Write an enzyme that holds these catalytic residues in place. Sequence first.
Site, PDB file in Angstrom:
ATOM      1  N   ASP A 173       0.778  -1.069  -0.139  1.00 28.38           N
ATOM      2  CA  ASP A 173       0.027   0.018   0.095  1.00 28.38           C
ATOM      3  C   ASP A 173       0.883   1.286   0.051  1.00 28.38           C
ATOM      4  O   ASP A 173       2.163   1.268   0.139  1.00 28.38           O
ATOM      5  CB  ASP A 173      -1.009  -0.073   1.292  1.00 28.38           C
ATOM      6  CG  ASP A 173      -0.072  -0.140   2.491  1.00 28.38           C
ATOM      7  OD1 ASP A 173       1.013   0.330   2.533  1.00 28.38           O
ATOM      8  OD2 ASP A 173      -0.625  -0.872   3.493  1.00 28.38           O
ATOM      9  N   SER A 174       0.475   2.512  -0.280  1.00 29.78           N
ATOM     10  CA  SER A 174       1.276   3.778  -0.188  1.00 29.78           C
ATOM     11  C   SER A 174       1.449   4.173   1.236  1.00 29.78           C
ATOM     12  O   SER A 174       2.337   5.234   0.975  1.00 29.78           O
ATOM     13  CB  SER A 174       0.313   4.593  -1.021  1.00 29.78           C
ATOM     14  OG  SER A 174      -0.951   4.811  -0.467  1.00 29.78           O
ATOM     15  N   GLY A 175       1.011   3.668   2.040  1.00 31.38           N
ATOM     16  CA  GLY A 175       1.345   4.369   3.548  1.00 31.38           C
ATOM     17  C   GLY A 175       0.442   5.267   3.870  1.00 31.38           C
ATOM     18  O   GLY A 175       0.244   5.715   5.142  1.00 31.38           O
ATOM     19  N   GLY A 176      -0.399   6.103   3.096  1.00 28.52           N
ATOM     20  CA  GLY A 176      -1.298   7.362   3.381  1.00 28.52           C
ATOM     21  C   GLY A 176      -2.216   7.059   4.385  1.00 28.52           C
ATOM     22  O   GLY A 176      -2.209   7.563   5.511  1.00 28.52           O
ATOM     23  N   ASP A 216      -8.056  -7.388   0.402  1.00 33.53           N
ATOM     24  CA  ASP A 216      -7.004  -7.297   1.745  1.00 33.53           C
ATOM     25  C   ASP A 216      -7.539  -6.967   2.909  1.00 33.53           C
ATOM     26  O   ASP A 216      -8.583  -5.949   2.738  1.00 33.53           O
ATOM     27  CB  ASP A 216      -5.755  -6.592   1.268  1.00 33.53           C
ATOM     28  CG  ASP A 216      -6.155  -5.189   1.719  1.00 33.53           C
ATOM     29  OD1 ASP A 216      -6.619  -4.561   0.797  1.00 33.53           O
ATOM     30  OD2 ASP A 216      -5.940  -4.802   2.938  1.00 33.53           O
ATOM     31  N   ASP A 233      -2.273   8.583  -2.095  1.00 34.50           N
ATOM     32  CA  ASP A 233      -3.613   9.306  -1.861  1.00 34.50           C
ATOM     33  C   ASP A 233      -3.689  10.073  -0.631  1.00 34.50           C
ATOM     34  O   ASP A 233      -3.111   9.695   0.170  1.00 34.50           O
ATOM     35  CB  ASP A 233      -4.607   8.397  -2.355  1.00 34.50           C
ATOM     36  CG  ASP A 233      -4.924   7.461  -1.598  1.00 34.50           C
ATOM     37  OD1 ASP A 233      -4.137   6.993  -0.772  1.00 34.50           O
ATOM     38  OD2 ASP A 233      -6.045   6.928  -1.443  1.00 34.50           O
ATOM     39  N   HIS A 279      -5.858 -21.551   9.883  1.00 34.65           N
ATOM     40  CA  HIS A 279      -7.319 -21.873   9.666  1.00 34.65           C
ATOM     41  C   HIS A 279      -8.028 -20.695   9.206  1.00 34.65           C
ATOM     42  O   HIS A 279      -8.792 -20.998   8.023  1.00 34.65           O
ATOM     43  CB  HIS A 279      -7.953 -22.416  10.910  1.00 34.65           C
ATOM     44  CG  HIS A 279      -9.791 -22.238  10.657  1.00 34.65           C
ATOM     45  ND1 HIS A 279     -10.041 -23.421   9.831  1.00 34.65           N
ATOM     46  CD2 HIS A 279     -10.599 -21.768  10.780  1.00 34.65           C
ATOM     47  CE1 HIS A 279     -11.343 -23.118   9.653  1.00 34.65           C
ATOM     48  NE2 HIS A 279     -11.666 -22.211  10.402  1.00 34.65           N
ATOM     49  N   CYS A 297      -8.023 -27.323   5.700  1.00 33.51           N
ATOM     50  CA  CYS A 297      -6.783 -26.962   6.286  1.00 33.51           C
ATOM     51  C   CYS A 297      -6.207 -27.959   7.000  1.00 33.51           C
ATOM     52  O   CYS A 297      -6.747 -28.704   7.878  1.00 33.51           O
ATOM     53  CB  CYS A 297      -6.857 -25.557   6.698  1.00 33.51           C
ATOM     54  SG  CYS A 297      -7.142 -25.529   8.642  1.00 33.51           S
ATOM     55  N   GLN A 322     -11.264   8.049  -5.504  1.00 35.06           N
ATOM     56  CA  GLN A 322     -11.600   8.591  -4.380  1.00 35.06           C
ATOM     57  C   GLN A 322     -12.899   9.119  -4.502  1.00 35.06           C
ATOM     58  O   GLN A 322     -13.694   8.980  -5.460  1.00 35.06           O
ATOM     59  CB  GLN A 322     -10.682   9.627  -3.562  1.00 35.06           C
ATOM     60  CG  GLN A 322      -9.552   8.950  -3.001  1.00 35.06           C
ATOM     61  CD  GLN A 322      -9.753   7.890  -1.847  1.00 35.06           C
ATOM     62  OE1 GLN A 322     -10.623   7.983  -1.168  1.00 35.06           O
ATOM     63  NE2 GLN A 322      -8.634   7.023  -1.695  1.00 35.06           N
ATOM     64  N   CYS A 324      -7.595 -28.331  10.650  1.00 34.02           N
ATOM     65  CA  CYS A 324      -8.828 -28.990  10.641  1.00 34.02           C
ATOM     66  C   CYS A 324      -8.675 -30.458  10.594  1.00 34.02           C
ATOM     67  O   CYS A 324      -9.703 -31.265  10.991  1.00 34.02           O
ATOM     68  CB  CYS A 324      -9.872 -28.501   9.939  1.00 34.02           C
ATOM     69  SG  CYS A 324     -10.434 -26.788  10.494  1.00 34.02           S
ATOM     70  N   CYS A 358     -13.954 -27.539   6.075  1.00 40.47           N
ATOM     71  CA  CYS A 358     -12.358 -27.104   6.026  1.00 40.47           C
ATOM     72  C   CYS A 358     -11.425 -28.078   5.629  1.00 40.47           C
ATOM     73  O   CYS A 358     -11.392 -28.910   6.605  1.00 40.47           O
ATOM     74  CB  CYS A 358     -12.067 -26.052   6.961  1.00 40.47           C
ATOM     75  SG  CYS A 358     -10.526 -25.404   6.703  1.00 40.47           S
ATOM     76  N   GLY A 409     -11.320   4.686   0.010  1.00 46.79           N
ATOM     77  CA  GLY A 409     -12.265   5.560   0.707  1.00 46.79           C
ATOM     78  C   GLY A 409     -13.515   4.773   1.394  1.00 46.79           C
ATOM     79  O   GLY A 409     -14.245   5.184   1.961  1.00 46.79           O
TER      80      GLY A 409
HETATM   81  N1  PRF Z   1     -10.532   1.090   3.153  1.00 47.44           N
HETATM   82  C1  PRF Z   1     -10.003   2.216   2.546  1.00 47.44           C
HETATM   83  C2  PRF Z   1      -8.453   2.009   2.510  1.00 47.44           C
HETATM   84  C3  PRF Z   1      -7.665   0.986   3.187  1.00 47.44           C
HETATM   85  N2  PRF Z   1      -6.351   1.126   2.850  1.00 47.44           N
HETATM   86  C4  PRF Z   1      -6.135   2.210   2.184  1.00 47.44           C
HETATM   87  N3  PRF Z   1      -5.132   2.746   1.545  1.00 47.44           N
HETATM   88  C5  PRF Z   1      -4.886   3.594   0.998  1.00 47.44           C
HETATM   89  N4  PRF Z   1      -3.781   4.223   0.383  1.00 47.44           N
HETATM   90  N5  PRF Z   1      -6.040   4.409   0.499  1.00 47.44           N
HETATM   91  C6  PRF Z   1      -7.348   3.983   0.869  1.00 47.44           C
HETATM   92  O1  PRF Z   1      -8.602   4.544   0.653  1.00 47.44           O
HETATM   93  C7  PRF Z   1      -7.453   2.687   1.859  1.00 47.44           C
HETATM   94 ZN    ZN Z   2      -9.529 -25.375   8.865  1.00 48.00          ZN
END
Ligand code: PRF
Ligand code: ZN
Lengths: 372, 372
Positions: A92-95, A270, A146, A339, A310, A193, A313, A308, A220
Amino acid sequence: RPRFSFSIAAREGKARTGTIEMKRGVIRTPAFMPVGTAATVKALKPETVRATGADIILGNTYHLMLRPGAERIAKLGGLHSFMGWDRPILTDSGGFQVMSLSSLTKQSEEGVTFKSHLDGSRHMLSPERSIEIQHLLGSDIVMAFDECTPYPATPSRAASSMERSMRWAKRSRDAFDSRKEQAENAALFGIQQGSVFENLRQQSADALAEIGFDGYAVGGLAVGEGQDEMFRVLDFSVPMLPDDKPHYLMGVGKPDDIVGAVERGIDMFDCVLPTRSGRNGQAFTWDGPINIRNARFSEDLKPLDSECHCAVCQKWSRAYIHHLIRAGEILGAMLMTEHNIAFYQQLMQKIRDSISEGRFSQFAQDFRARYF
Amino acid sequence: RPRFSFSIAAREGKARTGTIEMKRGVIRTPAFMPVGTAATVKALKPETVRATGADIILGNTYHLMLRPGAERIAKLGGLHSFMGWDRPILTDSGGFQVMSLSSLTKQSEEGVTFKSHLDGSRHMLSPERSIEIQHLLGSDIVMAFDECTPYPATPSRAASSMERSMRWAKRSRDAFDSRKEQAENAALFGIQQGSVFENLRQQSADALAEIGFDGYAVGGLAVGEGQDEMFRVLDFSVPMLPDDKPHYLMGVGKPDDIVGAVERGIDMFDCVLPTRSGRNGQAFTWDGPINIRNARFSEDLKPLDSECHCAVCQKWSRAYIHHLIRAGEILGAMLMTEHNIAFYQQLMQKIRDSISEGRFSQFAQDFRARYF
Ligand SMILES: NCc1c[nH]c2nc(N)[nH]c(=O)c12
Ligand SMILES: [Zn+2]
Ligand SMILES: NCc1c[nH]c2nc(N)[nH]c(=O)c12
Ligand SMILES: [Zn+2]
């Protein structure tokens, strides 16, 4: 394999199933990505993560830049080598994490400045630095940087944030493209967004398509609006994105949310739900989640879930896992997490198969009937 | 296989190497038994424990009787089925833990009464109840219930405690023998007491041999007397025990302590050192232990140990494990523990091989030279 190639094999309504081919591997979609917070998927060896069926995992840029540090990971050979996962990794970008985990944040058109939640160090994340950090980590799928919009948001504030995000999307694209090695081996996803407003979502979608990305995420959402509203926004938002590229719904992981999102055109997911649930003691089953700590499971010899497949289980009872969690034993976390991730992967597999067989609608119906 | 059969294949001085055959499996001696405190070897699946080379593990009676409870485990099918370990399991009698972990203890010739350290429940452990609990757990090697002597101890107190322990050894033997199923499928070990006094150790040894056991443990050591003194006591104590039966040194696990104990006739060991060390961050290496949290390992790409053949050293760097431990990640504990237990098993293997090849003395010398 190519740097990036998304191909749709079958469709049913708005739902799609196919594959994303990348240098490090093939990703089956719809896909669920386990989250590797600090260079590790909580309580699991990478081989175990793979055994559950995962094709790709997610890495948190915010956490990694804090510790061990982006430059350090690069010097050590990249994130893949560092943690022992040789398949695709989306970062992810970390924002998002910056605005929800750090403090004394200072936002501007240039980026954001903040202090770590670990100590008192400062950092200046921006589109350029975010892309650079993701490069240093050696990420396969890079997310544009973002500015997320809190819920609820007024039209004015949502528009301003969305507008800034699109300007940052362009900066992210150029940063990524300027780095030859990254542009030639990785992929770049843009993030839509606009809060819950249709006109803003449309403007965002158009701006992203104009710039051009390998994939498009719906950002968002899942920030407090509730499933009903989230689904309503997805109804008109997903169709706005390019049909021939992956659609990624960030931060969405409840089983029912995933089924509904796929029904609306989402290809990637995710969420920490699977892993975190391995803390409080929540185990997913086709009959709904159960809290293994409950006394009714103290002498229950059955596996977490009756169907399941896995390893957990196949070998251990609810009774044993119940004991482990109530005793605070590490093995408890390890088994619950394996699990739950396996359960999610089985859910994705059932979704992919049903779509490919033109019976996804029936699967969604049958799933909900028993899960609730 | 038979209920119990110990055979010595080779000797060098007081050192011996061979095997103990039991219904659930073969135990190679000298042997090191990982400790499974609460029905789990901290942070490891049973298959992983086996992968490191362990032939048998130890179970703590005190902890298990508190939770999940002896009767409950029996109703669930026994400890083996409960935790997923199908090989031999040796259970201690619980006496030691009662006098060091519980409170408001009330000792008498009948046994001991105490309150759990988990809550405020009471219990009345005795030779008969201890043997019964070990039966309920389905233990393969049952330890007699004794009264441990604190260090230092006066001749008078050590004699009184040793004398009571021998009376309790007889009661343990009869309890075990009265239970047909247990007497026919499990083995019973007696425990020698007497503190650091030669005459008391002799009286204890004679009393134990008179009763007759499948194995003999040297109890009361590693309780604060120091290696020099411990070794001095082992020098005259081990020869007092029957030569044709296993010799078990309880609570001894430091690598050097193990080497010295084997040199003095010990065949079995157990200690939490390996596992617990996976907490603070201590990793064993042939060059001595290292604290992985130390800054010098932040960018060290080498494995925990340069020679170790464990899965951890084949796949991850000191740098990665350093990060994991400093971040409090569960995977950190899992990897450190697997490596340490593997290291101990490799130590035992090198000991067994050197004895079988008549070069144990040289191995002990070479080991110490590099380890220190
Ligand atoms: N569920 C929104 C969300 C989760 N992680 C995120 N990461 C970024 N960069 N932007 C987003 O809008 C979100
Ligand atoms: Zn399982
Ligand atoms: N190191 C001494 C020791 C550890 N565990 C023990 N358990 C018992 N029953 N007796 C003992 O003397 C000991
Ligand atoms: Zn190792």
